[PDB]
Amino acid sequence: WDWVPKRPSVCTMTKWQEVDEMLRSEYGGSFRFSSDAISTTFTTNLTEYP
Amino acid sequence: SHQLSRADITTVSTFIDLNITMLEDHEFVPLEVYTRHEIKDSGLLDYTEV
């Protein structure tokens, strides 16, 4: 078989959704990401994920 | 002396204002994290295909 480098060949996370308008709000020491296109809301901590 | 239109005299409001707007109609689309085919494909070997 043809050999390819490991790092640019595999992905442990896969792109699922693209959101044009995902409103971000800061509330209760958390970030709320709300999308009306998919009617979906996520809650995250205020700190970035490296 | 003369006649006057109703608009000629400034009016003070004797009504208390109450503003209500309706809830907007929303549409929920079919959205799944993983489909049936992706979950089936997750397996490394399939006995039937092999």
Whole-number Cα distances in Å, A20 to A34, A38, B7, B30, B34:
11, 11, 49, 18, 21
CA distance B39 to chain A (A): 14
Is B29 close to A40, i.e. CB distance below 8 A?
no
Is residue B44 exposed (0-12), middle (13-18) or buried (19+ Cβ within 10 Å)?
exposed
Contact A32, A42 (CB under 8 A): yes
CA distance A46 to A29: 7
Resolution in A: 3.4
How far apart (Å, rounded) are the C-alpha atoms in residues B4 and B10? 12
B26/A16 CB distance under 8 A: no
* Structure-determination approach: cryo-EM
The whole-angstrom separation of Cα B24 and Cα A1 is 57
The three-state DSSP-derived secondary structure of B8-49 is HCCCCCCCCCCCCCCCCCCCCCCCCCCCHHHHHHCCCCCCCC
Å from A30 to nearest chain B CA?
Answer: 23
